[PDB]
């Protein structure tokens, strides 16, 4: 048994880290509708920029 490395199966998040930064704002082409061909647009429950 020669000693080598091994990516071990302990899933402990101590001595390891992810860069949990802020979630980016999603692009939203689905929100506002063209009511009849014209501007009757909708939000439908988000921070719609």
């Amino acid at each position: 048994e020669l000693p080598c490395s091994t990516y071990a199966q302990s899933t402990a998040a101590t001595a390891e880290e992810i860069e949990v930064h802020m979630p980016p704002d999603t692009p939203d082409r689905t929100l506002m509708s063209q009511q009849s061909g014209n501007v009757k647009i909708t939000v439908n429950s988000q921070t719609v920029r």
């Epitope: 506002m32 063209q34 009511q35 009849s36 061909g37 014209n38 501007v39 009757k40 647009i41």
Partner: nanobody, 117 residues
Framework: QIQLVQSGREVKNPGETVKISCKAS????????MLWVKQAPGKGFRWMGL????????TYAEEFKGRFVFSLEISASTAYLQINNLTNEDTATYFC??????????WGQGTTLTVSS
Amino acid sequence: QIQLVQSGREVKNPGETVKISCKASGYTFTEYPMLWVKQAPGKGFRWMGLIYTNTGEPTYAEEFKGRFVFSLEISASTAYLQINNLTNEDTATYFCVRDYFISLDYWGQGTTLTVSS
């Protein structure tokens, strides 16, 4: 408000052109197009797309491929349908629809394109 004052008689030859520029009173800028409409002899409505007044050009019809293509004078708030290469059945009515009254809420009354021998 929204009202596309459509052009008069658009005379066309066999394979000739058609151009109905409709001066769109109520050419806005903000949030909505002007739903253009082709008008056949019996069909009632036949939508030629959405295209704004200060938007400027029409997102055209779907099944109207052939001659028809939307255009407009964007700074004047005016739209138009130009249909070059005039076939036999090119005689029809044209309209815009200005998105105030938040559907296509300024319906064009019709512009008479007459392309015949």
